[PDB]
């Protein structure tokens, strides 16, 4: 299935995944293409934060679903 990851730069990252995929694995794919450390990768699903130790099925994430990506740095 295909999903749409929205970046803080208004970019739409189209990735190939499946319900049986883990959040950690999803972020790993983003990390390879975007070059952003998975530790700073905060995935959001309709305002809800996604746990790395879960699967897409845990949140009933189906095809054509929009996921958000917040770049959480260290500091302020």
């Amino acid at each position: 299935m295909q999903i749409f990851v929205k970046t803080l730069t208004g970019k739409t990252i189209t990735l190939e995944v499946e319900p049986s995929d883990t959040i950690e694995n999803v972020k790993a794919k983003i990390q390879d293409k975007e070059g952003i450390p998975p530790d700073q990768q905060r995935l959001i699903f309709a305002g809800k934060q996604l746990e790395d130790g879960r699967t897409l099925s845990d949140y009933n994430i189906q095809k054509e679903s929009t996921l958000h990506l917040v770049l959480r740095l260290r500091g302020g």
Partner: protein, 44 residues
């Protein structure tokens, strides 16, 4: 104009599934650095 909150970024942050309230408060403690604001608001 005391527009410390950039319109573009406000919409971007809210589009992530967050209310304007979270944006204002997070931005208030960051001072324009919405990237850090998101890092702050997302710790809840």
């Amino acid at each position: 104009g005391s527009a410390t909150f950039p319109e573009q970024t406000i919409k971007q942050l809210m589009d992530l599934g967050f209310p304007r309230d979270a944006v204002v408060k997070a931005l208030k403690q960051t001072n324009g650095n919405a990237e850090f604001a998101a890092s702050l608001l997302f710790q809840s």
